[PDB]
């Protein structure tokens, strides 16, 4: 029912990955999730569904055709090496600190207020 056709296929060895744009055809249905097209592209390219990253999926008027951008890596270490941190956090492979900019700024000003070893003591 739901088919995947791709275009603009290019392979670069300088990033150890292959990237392409993905066209999804799902007539009379809601827009597809990322996990289903990830495992479908995993079945298409004979790759484990853990180094495939997809993002930026928009919907045309009518909903017959949806486009998006994806990429296929070569191993998990290359995907952990050169990728944005937010997309790895979306895949759950990275966690970011839950501190706001504000309290960090008064913390930085409070260590700027005092001089010596007590900078680490006043930072709490």
């Amino acid at each position: 029912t739901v088919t995947i056709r791709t275009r603009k296929f290019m392979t670069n060895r300088l990033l150890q990955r292959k990237q392409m744009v993905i066209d999804v055809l799902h007539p009379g249905k809601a827009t597809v999730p990322k996990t289903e097209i990830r495992e479908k592209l995993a079945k298409m390219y004979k790759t484990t569904p853990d180094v495939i990253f997809v993002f930026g999926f928009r919907t045309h008027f009518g909903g017959g055709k949806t486009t998006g951008f994806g990429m296929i890596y070569d191993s998990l270490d290359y995907a952990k090496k050169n990728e944005p941190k937010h997309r790895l956090a979306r895949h759950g492979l990275y966690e970011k600190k839950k501190t706001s900019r504000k309290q960090r700024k008064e913390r930085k000003n409070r260590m700027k207020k005092v001089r010596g070893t007590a900078k680490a003591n006043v930072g709490a």
């Binding site: 290019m10 670069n12 300088l14 990033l15 050169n82 944005p84």
Partner: peptide
Amino acid sequence: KYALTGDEVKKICMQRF
């Protein structure tokens, strides 16, 4: 179009490539 972002150009460039 080997990179997309500013930092990806650095991750292309600085590794003696």
